[PDB]
Amino acid sequence: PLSNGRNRRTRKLFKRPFRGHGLSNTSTILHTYKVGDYVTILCNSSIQHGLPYKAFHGKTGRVWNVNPHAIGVMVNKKVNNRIVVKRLHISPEHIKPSGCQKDFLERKAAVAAIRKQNIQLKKEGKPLLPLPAKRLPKQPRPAELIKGADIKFTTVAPLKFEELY
Template structure:
């Protein structure tokens, strides 16, 4: 957007440094603020604007609960930073209106366990493990809740269809002068 800075200078008592094109200026937005690039991240879904439902405030959080962090644009107080949006953490502290959460955050080559305070409007309890525990209790079995790496492949025979396996090796180096 171009402004005529002569008009702007006299209206707002603003001093302009001299330059060859001082009659034109481009006003830039501040691209270092904490709410940058959150236009869609913190926006409310279609037909979900307005007052936050009261059930949000009636949820009971306990130490050790696993919660998802999702910033709600309706409530600006106690909103998590955009880097924590969509992350999952564990509750370590409960206050009247907020919960303290331990979240993993990658900083360059390290993963740090960060402690943040977030209001309850921006959190949601994760109950998948509770369902698994309940089913296991009914069956009387034990359930693995932590994710496991893929196990190695089981032993099996490889069919060669009558062809003998070849030994592949690099060609020896020959000095040519």
């Protein structure tokens, strides 16, 4: 049975990382957040003012508004049988640049590079390059040959039981 305090059960959640006490980075306050970016709420206990609620720790959200000292973050919250939109204003000391779309962002660059070449080839007459192939799960491996000149054999059999004492 717990109490209904605001920061209950934060002996390990709100503890600082091992050898990670003191001041934070400088890039934390220098990072430029823009509306539409993806951020991660990470309550920094070293800054007790404006500390977000413990339920949003680790949640990924979208920046919806930028204010002179605080960054607006919009995350999804789960309620009895529905989902509601939570709008928060969080100082940069508690948010972090999310890397959720890191894989997606490089695929857009790969396609945009190919598409930029297809406008350098069609008008000049050269055949146009195709778009990169789509991602697929690990497919069944095909048949192949294994050379018998650089191969070696090791037999496998159950091991005789040897005591550890």
